[PDB]
Amino acid sequence: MDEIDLRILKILQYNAKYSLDEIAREIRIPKSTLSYRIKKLEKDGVIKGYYAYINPASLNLDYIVITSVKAKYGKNYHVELGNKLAQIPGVWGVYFVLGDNDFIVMARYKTREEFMEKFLERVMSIPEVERASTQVVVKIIKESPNIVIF
Amino acid sequence: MDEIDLRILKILQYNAKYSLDEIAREIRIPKSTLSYRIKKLEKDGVIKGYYAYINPASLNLDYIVITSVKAKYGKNYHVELGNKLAQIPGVWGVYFVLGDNDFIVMARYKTREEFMEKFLERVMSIPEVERASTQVVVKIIKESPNIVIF
Amino acid sequence: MDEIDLRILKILQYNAKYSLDEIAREIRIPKSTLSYRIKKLEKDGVIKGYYAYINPASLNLDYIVITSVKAKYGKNYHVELGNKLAQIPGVWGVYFVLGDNDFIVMARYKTREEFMEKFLERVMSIPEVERASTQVVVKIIKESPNIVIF
Amino acid sequence: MDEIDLRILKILQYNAKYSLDEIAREIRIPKSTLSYRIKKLEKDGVIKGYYAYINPASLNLDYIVITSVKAKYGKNYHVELGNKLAQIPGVWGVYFVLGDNDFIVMARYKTREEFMEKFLERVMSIPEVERASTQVVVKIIKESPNIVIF
Amino acid sequence: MDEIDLRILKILQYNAKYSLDEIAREIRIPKSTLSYRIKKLEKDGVIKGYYAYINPASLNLDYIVITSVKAKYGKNYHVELGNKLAQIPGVWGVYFVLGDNDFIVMARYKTREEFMEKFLERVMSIPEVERASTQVVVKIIKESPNIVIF
Amino acid sequence: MDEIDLRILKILQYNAKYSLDEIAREIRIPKSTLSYRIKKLEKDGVIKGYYAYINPASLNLDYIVITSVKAKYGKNYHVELGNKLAQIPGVWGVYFVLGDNDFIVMARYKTREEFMEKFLERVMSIPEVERASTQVVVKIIKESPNIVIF
Amino acid sequence: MDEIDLRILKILQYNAKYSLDEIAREIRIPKSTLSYRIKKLEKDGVIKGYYAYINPASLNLDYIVITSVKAKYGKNYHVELGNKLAQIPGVWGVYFVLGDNDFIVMARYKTREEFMEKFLERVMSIPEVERASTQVVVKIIKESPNIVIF
Amino acid sequence: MDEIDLRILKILQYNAKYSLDEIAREIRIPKSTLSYRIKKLEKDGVIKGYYAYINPASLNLDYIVITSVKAKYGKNYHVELGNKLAQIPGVWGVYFVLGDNDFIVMARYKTREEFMEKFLERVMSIPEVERASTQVVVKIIKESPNIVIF
Numbered sequence A, B, C, D, E, F, G, H: 001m002d003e004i005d006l007r008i009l010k011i012l013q014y015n016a017k018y019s020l021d022e023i024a025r026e027i028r029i030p031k032s033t034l035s036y037r038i039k040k041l042e043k044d045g046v047i048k049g050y051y052a053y054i055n056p057a058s059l060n061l062d063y064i065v066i067t068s069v070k071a072k073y074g075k076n077y078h079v080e081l082g083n084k085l086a087q088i089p090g091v092w093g094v095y096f097v098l099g100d101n102d103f104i105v106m107a108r109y110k111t112r113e114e115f116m117e118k119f120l121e122r123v124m125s126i127p128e129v130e131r132a133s134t135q136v137v138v139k140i141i142k143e144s145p146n147i148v149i150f
């Protein structure tokens, strides 16, 4: 990757429906070169794909939660817990972090009941779980994971 | 929105570069109808946009952090702190949550130094900040915010 | 339910011994209509019943406690713990909450000894209990659960 | 108060619409005596009143919260904070407790937004508040404050 | 007990070697009456005994500790843990408290090593112990348990 | 101090009303020598005094508390807070400890109200107090501060 | 050891490559005496050895961590855990401390991955480990363990 | 640096008094080459110096402490606090860490009093200090900071 690729990415991260002609004009380079570079980037796996950004509200995803999960130590309990957490419907993010040396789980649901039946009940039944603490998100000030280049 | 729109969205959330002809075939509907519905969805704001999914590693974003920030109570300190946190370069997520009744901030950087100079030093200088606790992410088990329909 | 029912409820929540004639006069409607609506409300279960508000002091309920209980994860331990907690004499409130993802138990007793023998000893013997933390209430600034309409 | 008064209270705490004739029959005493005793109890303030028990769901009170509030020490900050908390619409319970030596606040709202605008924003603006931690109630296993005699 | 007994106790709590003649003079009562009352108090168990107040430093008791111990719930673990803690040489105080709903243990030793071998190693070997947290006392601002009447 | 003095102290710590003749017989030494040594010990300050051990219950000291107090840092706030805490009526013990690097305060009162008016209200008014956490003692398994030699 | 030995040590702790002639001149004593004393010190074990102070950065030791480890109580679990922690490659410091009554482990690694594979995975597999909390060091303000005499 | 330099360092980190002839023999290289490389390493700053390893006990450094210090946010308070902490006599280590986002301070003293007068009193007087928590080290299982190559 070079300076050029960055500018391309800085644009595609925001809007992938920006016609080549428009991008070519902005960064001032041959449309055929651009097309080539974009292919290169995908080939190499820099650009892993293109997604539609859907508004969660539009799907009535009102119950937003961030849960910290502490795992029981020993055997392979840790790694196993992470994967079990990542497959729960509604969970889009699972991170293993230092500090509380545990998992941080991001999930979304339409209501409390859905949350309870799909997430909580499942979680409370997992043996490797020592403890879980759920923080209800009451306001999303910002959520732009797509923005990787500032 | 109806059952049909969902199926369309369930596909566009994963891959927006799926030609209409291919989608039309999968959900079995006229390509012109599909195109219409997709336009409708954008018009109404269900689909807010299309992004390129860029691999963070490809940009050497190695220092991943999740920080909890407690704000000083009173005046308008809270709301103000959230916005100041959302404009720090590298920060893609800011949530106000219950429980610790504070902010959860998601950010990414290439290194510790970058993290320190761009995020920490800035944060430690904000007056409204009572306390901040940063959790270093050592492993991303899953990060698919794009998946809103399971 | 309509605007009218609300006004009726806003009155019955405070004082259920308010003669129909008096209520009819306040909200200005036929006493027979009122009587009908009140019946409707009970029928439908909006009004689940009428109680006598007894002063706890009058019964020497001096030892007031609020206990947080953490449950051991797995099996059905959680749901089971809640019900065991709800049947302890003296306990009038059991809530399963997020954050500490545990139970909050409200209870009243005449003395420390009663508290110990009826609540604590029972609680400490429950297997599913991981930990319990009791907060002694030294002052009730307000306790009006009956007020549902402000 | 004597053994008799207790039996009367043990009944009125559950259902105050139980005709004198029915109560008189249960406890086996003259209806005129009963009526006298009940008056005595009210006179003396044992029975402070009769309320209608309204189902919160019936009023769409879905967002149930239990908040711990720590106050800034000094002056009269403490006592003042308690009263300010007790007058927030939606708050039915305020207790000053030992342990975390702070306040426990019980409140109910129809939604998150209502909760935010009526409770949180108000609370975050109170100067005497050092910190507040809100626990969202996801399940009410039991709530019978009316039951004072077991 | 009456007003007189109090004055007697308020003196004996400070200095038990105060001749009857001196006390009799201070509270102005017959020495024979005093002697009688003091006997009464012992008889009834108000005065459980007379001790020599020994300076801990004089015995090189330099390592002063206050330890909080959390017990594993269930069976009779709790009560059993308390008694095991009360028999450890060096431990003069064991309290079961609310809040952290655990034990607070007061002990004294001449050195760190003594502390380790007599207290810690013993404690760490007790099964019923979930966790222990020792707070080293660096300064005794006041220690007058003998003063019960202010 | 020598081996002999210890044996003397090991006895006087338990019961100071043990006639010289009895002690002389137990440790097998001349009564005049004993009397001399005891004087020496007092002279040198090993034995600081003799107290009457009064049963707290006998004085209706039912509300027993152990409070942790965190002080605001800076100036001389710390040392000042300790002394203010040591002069509150009912407080018999004040320790400055490491770990939570704060104060541990032991106090006794007859009731909750007394506790509130004499201890809490006073404490909450002290400026240097950052935070206080009171643990109610529900059971004294052991309290023998007089025993310094095991 | 005497005043002289101290001055010698105060120099050797900083720079052991300081020729005898130079030291002899600084402390003003016969070079043969100095040489003798230094030998004495080693003989007696005051000086346990001489090391080369290597800059960690020079070895790309970028991932610096400080981990608190809580051990499961009972048997000999504690002592055993300490030794297992002290033999993990990268760990240069293991301390058993009071307060959290646990272990504090100091370690260094070149990267996150190394840290994970050599330290974390090993630690998470140890049975006696109740919980571990890793604090990432982002800045070393000072690290001069060699300085024992100020 | 190359493979050779490592072997040299792996030896000098343990014992710097190992004659060149001995090292030359172990790693099998010309003594003149070795001498050259060692000079290179110092020149480049890989080897920053040679120290005498002094046994702390030999200096009666019995009171070993590890203190966590939280700083007040804002201005330049943080950076300033670190430097003030690094200049306190007895302090050999100051680290700024994530998690509790604070300072970890390592210090040694001969006694509690020294600790109090030199470290604590100084620390409690620093304004930028929000809170400090000292953990007394009761056992050093391992302390070999000199070992950088395993």
Ligand SMILES: NC(=O)CC[C@H](N)C(=O)O
Pocket: A021, A024, A029, A030, A031, A032, A033
């Ligand atoms: N720069 C452009 O947009 C087009 C350049 C050139 N004609 C090409 O398409 O290869």
Ligand SMILES: NC(=O)CC[C@H](N)C(=O)O
Pocket: B021, B024, B029, B030, B031, B032, B033
């Ligand atoms: N279903 C299709 O793919 C095409 C249908 C129809 N010929 C249209 O394009 O409107």
Ligand SMILES: NC(=O)CC[C@H](N)C(=O)O
Pocket: C021, C024, C029, C030, C031, C032, C033
């Ligand atoms: N409004 C009243 O109080 C009475 C109205 C009418 N006479 C009725 O009883 O039905």
Ligand SMILES: NC(=O)CC[C@H](N)C(=O)O
Pocket: D021, D024, D029, D030, D031, D032, D033
């Ligand atoms: N016991 C009753 O119900 C009635 C008793 C008696 N006739 C009265 O009313 O005074």
Ligand SMILES: NC(=O)CC[C@H](N)C(=O)O
Pocket: E021, E024, E029, E030, E031, E032, E033
């Ligand atoms: N008051 C005294 O000291 C002595 C009173 C009286 N002579 C008695 O001893 O009984």
Ligand SMILES: NC(=O)CC[C@H](N)C(=O)O
Pocket: F021, F024, F029, F030, F031, F032, F033
């Ligand atoms: N040993 C005793 O009790 C008395 C010894 C000796 N006659 C004395 O009193 O000095």
Ligand SMILES: NC(=O)CC[C@H](N)C(=O)O
Pocket: G021, G024, G029, G030, G031, G032, G033
């Ligand atoms: N003081 C010195 O440096 C040397 C003293 C004396 N000539 C010796 O070497 O023993």
Ligand SMILES: NC(=O)CC[C@H](N)C(=O)O
Pocket: H021, H024, H029, H030, H031, H032, H033
């Ligand atoms: N290898 C050695 O120890 C010595 C090698 C060679 N004679 C030199 O000193 O340069």
Ligand SMILES: [Mg+2]
Pocket: A051, A146, B051, B052, B053, B146
């Ligand atoms: Mg995207």
Ligand SMILES: [Mg+2]
Pocket: C051, C146, D051, D052, D053, D146
């Ligand atoms: Mg009611």
Ligand SMILES: [Mg+2]
Pocket: E051, E146, F051, F052, F053, F146
């Ligand atoms: Mg005494």
Ligand SMILES: [Mg+2]
Pocket: G051, G146, H051, H052, H053, H146
């Ligand atoms: Mg060294």
